[PDB]
Amino acid sequence: IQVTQPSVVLASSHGVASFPCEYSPSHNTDEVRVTVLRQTNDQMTEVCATTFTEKNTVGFLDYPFCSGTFNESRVNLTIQGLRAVDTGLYLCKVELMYPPPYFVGMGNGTQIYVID
Ligand code: NA
């Protein structure tokens, strides 16, 4: 599977950034685990993760600072609570959890600029 996302996003004055993560090939019947990772000058750290299905389309309910809805071939992500120090590259990881066989893909990352 191939994962794509926009190259850059400017966060709002309220520290909110939204962007889509798309994967392919896709079917409406897929079950997918989506993780958002952050990269700065070093390792990629996990920000939030959720699992979506055909029926379970509203994700990240257990993270106050991530939201996401699953619509066909893409997840529409929103990250909140951002501060200037949070400027960095935000990568989508998409795992196809059902049906088998398993696949995992990484997006190229969306650079999020946050100005205080
Ligand atoms: Na949330």
Curated annotation (Swiss-Prot):
GO terms for biological process: adaptive immune response; regulation of T cell proliferation. Residues 9-13, 113-116 are annotated as: Homodimerization. Residues 1-108 form the Ig-like V-type domain. Residues 97-102 are annotated as: Important for interaction with CD80 and CD86. It is found in: Cell membrane. N-glycosylation is important for dimerization. Residues 1-116 are extracellular. It comes from the Eukaryota. This is Cytotoxic T-lymphocyte protein 4. The lineage of its organism: Eukaryota, Metazoa, Chordata, Craniata, Vertebrata. The gene is Ctla4. The chain holds residues 38 to 153 of 223 of the full protein.
